[PDB]
Design an enzyme around this catalytic site. Sequence first.
Site, PDB file in Angstrom:
ATOM      1  N   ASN A   1      27.998   8.907  33.197  1.00 52.19           N
ATOM      2  CA  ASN A   1      27.485  10.141  32.601  1.00 52.19           C
ATOM      3  C   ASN A   1      28.007  11.392  33.301  1.00 52.19           C
ATOM      4  OD1 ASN A   1      24.093   8.820  32.045  1.00 52.19           O
ATOM      5  ND2 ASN A   1      25.980   8.420  30.897  1.00 52.19           N
TER       6      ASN A   1
ATOM      7  N   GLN B   1      20.952  15.581  40.798  1.00 50.21           N
ATOM      8  CA  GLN B   1      22.258  15.264  40.219  1.00 50.21           C
ATOM      9  C   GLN B   1      23.367  15.443  41.247  1.00 50.21           C
ATOM     10  OE1 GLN B   1      23.025  13.650  37.335  1.00 50.21           O
ATOM     11  NE2 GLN B   1      20.786  13.498  37.312  1.00 50.21           N
TER      12      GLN B   1
ATOM     13  N   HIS C   1      17.457   4.229  28.603  1.00 46.61           N
ATOM     14  CA  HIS C   1      17.965   2.858  28.501  1.00 46.61           C
ATOM     15  C   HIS C   1      17.730   2.299  27.099  1.00 46.61           C
ATOM     16  CE1 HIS C   1      17.785   3.148  32.968  1.00 46.61           C
ATOM     17  NE2 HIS C   1      18.952   2.552  32.792  1.00 46.61           N
TER      18      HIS C   1
HETATM   19  C1  LIG Z   1      22.236  11.005  34.545  1.00 47.86           C
HETATM   20  O1  LIG Z   1      21.691  10.981  35.863  1.00 47.86           O
HETATM   21  C2  LIG Z   1      21.358   9.755  36.370  1.00 47.86           C
HETATM   22  C3  LIG Z   1      21.606   8.559  35.736  1.00 47.86           C
HETATM   23  C4  LIG Z   1      21.244   7.338  36.311  1.00 47.86           C
HETATM   24  C5  LIG Z   1      20.609   7.340  37.550  1.00 47.86           C
HETATM   25  C6  LIG Z   1      20.348   8.552  38.197  1.00 47.86           C
HETATM   26  C7  LIG Z   1      20.712   9.753  37.622  1.00 47.86           C
HETATM   27  O2  LIG Z   1      20.499  10.984  38.179  1.00 47.86           O
HETATM   28  C8  LIG Z   1      19.844  11.012  39.443  1.00 47.86           C
HETATM   29  C9  LIG Z   1      20.184   6.057  38.217  1.00 47.86           C
HETATM   30  N1  LIG Z   1      20.169   4.975  37.228  1.00 47.86           N
HETATM   31  C10 LIG Z   1      19.093   4.202  36.982  1.00 47.86           C
HETATM   32  O3  LIG Z   1      18.972   3.485  36.003  1.00 47.86           O
HETATM   33  C11 LIG Z   1      21.409   4.845  36.471  1.00 47.86           C
HETATM   34  C12 LIG Z   1      21.550   6.059  35.577  1.00 47.86           C
HETATM   35 MG   LIG Z   2      20.745  -1.780  33.784  1.00 48.22          MG
HETATM   36 ZN   LIG Z   3      22.859   0.707  31.995  1.00 51.30          ZN
END
Ligand SMILES: COc1cc2c(cc1OC)CN(C=O)CC2
Ligand SMILES: [Mg+2]
Ligand SMILES: [Zn+2]
EC number: 3.1.4.53
Lengths: 324, 323
Positions: B233, B281, B72
Amino acid sequence: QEDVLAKELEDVNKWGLHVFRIAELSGNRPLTVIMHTIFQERDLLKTFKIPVDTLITYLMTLEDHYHADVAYHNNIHAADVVQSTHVLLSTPALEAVFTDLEILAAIFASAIHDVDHPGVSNQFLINTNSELALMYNDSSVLENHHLAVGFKLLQEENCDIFQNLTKKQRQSLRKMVIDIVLATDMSKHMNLLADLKTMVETKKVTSSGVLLLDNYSDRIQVLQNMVHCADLSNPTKPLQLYRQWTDRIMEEFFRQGDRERERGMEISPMCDKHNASVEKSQVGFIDYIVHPLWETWADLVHPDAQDILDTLEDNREWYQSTIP
Amino acid sequence: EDVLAKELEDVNKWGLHVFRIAELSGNRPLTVIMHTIFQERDLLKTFKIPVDTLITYLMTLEDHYHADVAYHNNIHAADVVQSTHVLLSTPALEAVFTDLEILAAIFASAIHDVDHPGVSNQFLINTNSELALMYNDSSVLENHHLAVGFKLLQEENCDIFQNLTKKQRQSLRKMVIDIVLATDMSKHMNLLADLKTMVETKKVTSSGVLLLDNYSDRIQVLQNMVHCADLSNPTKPLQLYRQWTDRIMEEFFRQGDRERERGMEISPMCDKHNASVEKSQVGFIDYIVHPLWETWADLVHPDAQDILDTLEDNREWYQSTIP
Ligand SMILES: COc1cc2c(cc1OC)CN(C=O)CC2
Ligand SMILES: [Mg+2]
Ligand SMILES: [Zn+2]
Ligand SMILES: COc1cc2c(cc1OC)CN(C=O)CC2
Ligand SMILES: [Mg+2]
Ligand SMILES: [Mg+2]
Ligand SMILES: [Mg+2]
Ligand SMILES: [Zn+2]
């Protein structure tokens, strides 16, 4: 003087308590002495193992964080909403309905619900780009702040009145208090009232005749509307109390309107001391907000609140009679 | 600096080399990508934003993303900005959003995680943090991101909205707040249900362009659009996706280390001694990302097909890494 104060506090279970006299007799500590009296009356210190010195220290600090120079949203208003909630909690239709923790949440919420109020509206704070509105993204600006202050003050020296609650109890109380104080935002009134009407139309009562509330949503909704009713209870009080509350809210409104007029802003409704109709504004307030709410609460607890509703209707007639 | 300009020619494409741009720009991807998008959409001329004020604000904003937070950070912010920029140009969304709505969505994307501490809302609530105390346990991070993003406009020569009318500023502010609050994952299920409802009742031209008459529907699409960008992503080329996965797991593990040290229950996917990165994932795609993006794809059918194809390729690859 302490004897007269004690005499007046014997009325703490009555609608129409002499709250302005108690404020004077207590040395401007109505919130502390009324909260202490109610906690003793409900045995809450014993039930939750609250040290008396911790309760008094917290109450005095909380009361200090109400603004003594604000005409309406001050410690007297807080004490009044506390005591009014305490009376509403005792209504026969709610006997044995709520737990001690829910009772604690409703009373604590009432005590903190306007703490650190600056005497101007959410809309004023938004329109003037205030730090509060910037912190809270224009959403329930004051009410979020009242909660944050009320909870933060528990962390001051010898102020954690909830020190002996379990973790689950503290977690539950915190959530209930947040839910209750956020419901005092008038921008939520219409949806809150619509929901309360739906509950009245579908209400279930037990074999003893009390309300059946068997899920969090229904339980918190009743407590939200209860504290909202207490917050909007001034026109339901004996007229000598109601008129003093009206004097105070109009002073606060006029001071805000003076600031809006200064800044070239459009003056908020009822805030122009040069184009004011106090009596018409009270009749409109009752007709469109207070009586719709209190008639629905009276329906929910029917017939427990009939005398309160009768007083509201008498006060509406009185204010109306001063117009022609 | 010429290779940086070369990379930025893909600013309108899904799969921009955002990590390369972050390195080539001296860790300023948010600034250079926002600047590029504002020029490409001529938002500076449309809204009379002095270029010096824009750059000054963008650098201050970027400075308030934490460089020691693995996921982040300013690269994620730049990625969400650029992803929103591409989704705004979906052909099925032509003629839907006003210029102010476009500025709101892009600005919201840029600020949507600013000053993120690299721990979750639940961690902030459970540690009795000052943030959770301020915001009454409700969308704690997201309220803070908004408050910082807007507060920074008040710094010297940082008010990029100075030549907007008072009414325009009030409308943009409301839209930005509505969009960033919708990035709270606790709102995902309700957001998705409303996107689905809109898909079932969607009205289009003969050419298949969406017709969104009321503000309630338009802000719902913008909320879901930035939410999709936030959750984009797994829809990117695998080389990008794998870098994002490495970063989110490093951040999650650092949270789990703080939880373990404090004696707290370790949050899901945060235990480095008991993780399954690949299974996580696949589950994240199966239960969150693919339902969202296939609903989005239905809304803008067929304009999201290549994005959805990449997502499905990547899910298949991650599953194949599980023995
Ligand atoms: C790239 O994989 C992920 C990205 C994100 C999350 C979980 C993920 O994998 C399990 C959950 N989040 C929390 O902020 C948003 C981004
Ligand atoms: Mg956020
Ligand atoms: Zn974000
Ligand atoms: C006693 O009369 C009033 C009281 C209150 C309001 C308006 C009133 O009259 C028009 C509106 N409120 C704002 O905070 C709550 C209290
Ligand atoms: Mg209030
Ligand atoms: Mg229209
Ligand atoms: Mg393909
Ligand atoms: Zn109040």
